[PDB]
Design a protein around this ligand. Structure first.
Ligand SMILES: Nc1c(C(=O)c2cccc(OC[C@@H](O)CO)c2)cnn1-c1ccc(F)cc1
Length: 330
């Protein structure tokens, strides 16, 4: 066990191991605050998220457990992974704080070769994630941390402007049909289109407007898709709206690489059974310059049985401590 040091930066208190020096506060969030930090052991710059209020409620307790379990499991070039996890607490009883340490990236979310590399990496990262039955579910430019090699990593959570709903698959925002992993692909689509044009594709001012903007482009659900809407409420809503034709995506993404536009038509379909998977998306002609199937690996199986559990603050708290204790750096 290493020795720690204390620090107040931005009204929040920080208790890290000496091995992490020069804490620079660089971003904040709903579930915590990230500091930049130099790691004396590896000689690398790293990020440190101190989870804010990790064990305040059953919802916080579970969430904290969830975050740790996922980062511990993520091992991939395009997905943010745990370099170190620690706590100033010397026992489970005192255990009140959780710090997560990962790589320092650079920034967030240009030429068609850039879009290609960036989107390639996101989709290489969603192939993996998706392979372990995980769905990012809130994929957006600010969970996409790039450095100057242009090298991408998917963040579990971003930093703090961009509305989440600007990037949500209709299905999982209007709760309107059975959803699958391909909710992230809708987002990648929305992200990809932004990189190409410079403009948010679906810059909606709320749920109803968002749906208006998506339908402008993609067209109202036809009889084959209306068929799969499970909500009495939403079928009503859709069918009542004034009917819109589907657009030619070349007329909307003009001068964009025709292969880029083909990938877009393939990602931005309402019918989540038709939508292109990550694994499929990589084999698209658009990525010819980077696609390599012997190097788009899948992930170890991931036990999310815990998601279906109702436990007590203290129990979750204990499982998390377990995961701190059971860590091994790479
Ligand atoms: N690794 C990162 C970053 C970054 O590296 C990052 C992201 C965007 C911008 C950014 O700025 C870097 C420079 O401005 C400061 O050196 C860093 C932001 N959050 N996280 C993160 C940390 C610990 C976790 F457990 C989970 C996620």
């Amino acid at each position: 066990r290493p020795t720690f040091y204390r620090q107040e930066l931005n009204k929040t208190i920080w208790e890290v191991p000496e091995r992490y020096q020069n804490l620079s506060p660089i971003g904040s969030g709903a579930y915590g605050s990230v500091c930049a930090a130099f790691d004396t052991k590896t000689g690398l710059r790293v990020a440190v998220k101190k989870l804010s209020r990790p064990f305040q409620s059953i919802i916080h307790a579970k969430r904290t457990y969830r975050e740790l379990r996922l980062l511990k499991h993520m091992k991939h070039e395009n997905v943010i992974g745990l370099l170190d996890v620690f706590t100033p607490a010397r026992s489970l009883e005192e255990f009140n704080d959780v710090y997560l340490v990962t790589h320092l990236m650079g920034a967030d979310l240009l030429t068609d070769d850039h879009v290609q590399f960036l989107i390639y990496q996101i989709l290489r990262g969603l192939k993996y994630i998706h392979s372990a039955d995980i769905i990012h579910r809130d994929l957006k430019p600010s969970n996409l941390a790039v450095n100057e090699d242009c090298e991408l990593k998917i963040l579990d959570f971003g930093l703090a402007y961009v509305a989440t709903r600007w990037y949500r698959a209709p299905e999982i925002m209007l709760n309107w049909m059975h959803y699958n992993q391909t909710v992230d692909i809708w987002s990648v689509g929305c992200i990809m289109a932004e990189l190409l044009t410079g403009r948010t594709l679906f810059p909606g001012t709320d749920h109803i407007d968002q749906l208006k903007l998506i339908l402008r482009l993609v067209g109202t659900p036809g009889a084959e898709l209306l068929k799969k809407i499970s909500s009495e409420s939403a079928r009503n809503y859709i069918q009542s709206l004034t009917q819109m034709p589907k657009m030619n995506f070349a007329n909307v993404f003009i001068g964009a690489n025709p292969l880029a536009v083909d990938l877009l038509e393939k990602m931005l379909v309402l019918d989540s059974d038709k939508r292109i998977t990550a694994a499929q998306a990589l084999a698209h002609a658009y990525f010819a310059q980077y696609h390599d199937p012997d190097d788009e690996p899948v992930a170890d199986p991931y036990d999310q049985s815990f998601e279906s559990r109702d436990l007590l603050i203290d129990e979750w708290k204990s499982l998390t401590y377990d995961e701190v204790i059971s860590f091994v750096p790479p």
